[PDB]
């Protein structure tokens, strides 16, 4: 389902966070890793956030390998995590919002929603973020923002993405000229059979509200152009 169930398959929001006082996963010890996941189990594992629901912590060590398979194929976790002995996934019973632990960064909040619903997803990622942040001193700095392992994520720590099925735009050959237009607007589109994924190119400089607004405007224009081209053929 979702608002534009026909055009956009999903809207994703991803917030990378790190503990201030714990080394990042590039340098941290196993004790530090197990302690992060233990802190999450103790103060979030069976807790609710109203509107979003009950969270439950799935630790990798205790998961069935086929259970790991299912989480991977639902995009709740990246493959590297399945063989990590310390990674985790705090899932809502809804399953739309997940919190990956001990991967590239200490924390990665994910909101995967089905339709064209970027700003709802953003709102939920923010709720989750605020909820975690009342128990976790985040790695933050006034000039740089939210501090991340890779330099490509520093600042808002936010990756926003939208999945789109544009058969008519590809068929009407418009796709060719649209792609450079998308790239000059500071968005990266990677094609992944007529499925494309647009997402924000940068994470530092803009604000999150504006990152999501920019992506949202562009997606909406693509939705209108696709409905037009489909009405044409």
């Amino acid at each position: 389902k979702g608002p534009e169930s026909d055009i956009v398959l999903s809207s994703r929001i991803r917030l990378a966070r790190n503990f201030e006082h714990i080394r990042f996963p590039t340098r941290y010890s196993n004790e530090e890793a197990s302690s992060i996941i233990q802190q999450f189990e103790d103060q979030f594992s069976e807790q609710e956030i109203p509107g979003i629901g009950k969270f439950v912590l799935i630790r990798m060590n205790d998961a069935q390998p086929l259970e790991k398979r299912v989480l991977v194929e639902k995009h709740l976790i990246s493959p590297n995590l399945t063989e990590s002995p310390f990674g985790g996934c705090l899932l809502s019973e809804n399953e739309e919002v997940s919190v990956m632990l001990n991967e590239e960064d200490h924390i990665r909040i994910q909101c995967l929603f089905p339709g064209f619903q970027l700003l709802e997803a953003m709102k939920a990622a923010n709720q989750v973020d605020d909820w975690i942040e009342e128990k976790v001193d985040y790695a933050f700095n006034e000039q740089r923002g939210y501090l991340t392992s890779c330099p490509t994520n520093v600042g808002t720590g936010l990756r926003a993405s939208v999945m789109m099925h544009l058969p008519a735009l590809v068929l009407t050959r418009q796709i060719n000229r649209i792609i450079p237009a998308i790239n000059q607007l500071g968005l990266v589109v990677r094609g992944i059979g007529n499925i494309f994924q647009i997402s924000n190119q940068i994470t530092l400089g803009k604000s999150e509200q504006d990152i999501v607004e920019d992506l949202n405007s562009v997606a909406a224009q693509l939705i209108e152009q696709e409905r037009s081209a489909r009405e044409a053929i």
Partner: protein
């Protein structure tokens, strides 16, 4: 030629690996990261977005503290010492409030 006092990384190590080791690498490679940020974020180098709720107090305070330390410097220069005693005690008050 520095290394991070928290996770030990050097800037050459950072060049090879491509990832920061801990939170403090950011402070101890501040200068060198700015060219990298510029390349990666279309010339942007300063954050213009969210601030977490609990800590936002702390950082507001620290900004005040730095503004008053600069004002204190200027006040000492002018030989305006009663004002300087005030500013010193205010800085001390805000720093106590942090911890």
């Amino acid at each position: 030629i520095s290394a991070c006092p928290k996770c030990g990384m050097t800037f050459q190590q950072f060049r090879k690996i491509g990832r920061f080791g801990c939170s403090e690498c950011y402070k101890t490679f501040h200068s060198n990261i700015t060219p990298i940020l510029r390349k990666v974020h279309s010339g942007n180098t300063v954050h213009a977005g969210k601030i977490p709720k609990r800590i936002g107090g702390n950082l507001h305070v620290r900004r005040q503290i730095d503004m008053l330390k600069k004002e204190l410097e200027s006040l000492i220069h002018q030989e305006e010492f009663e004002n300087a005693a005030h500013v010193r005690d205010q800085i001390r008050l805000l720093e106590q409030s942090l911890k």
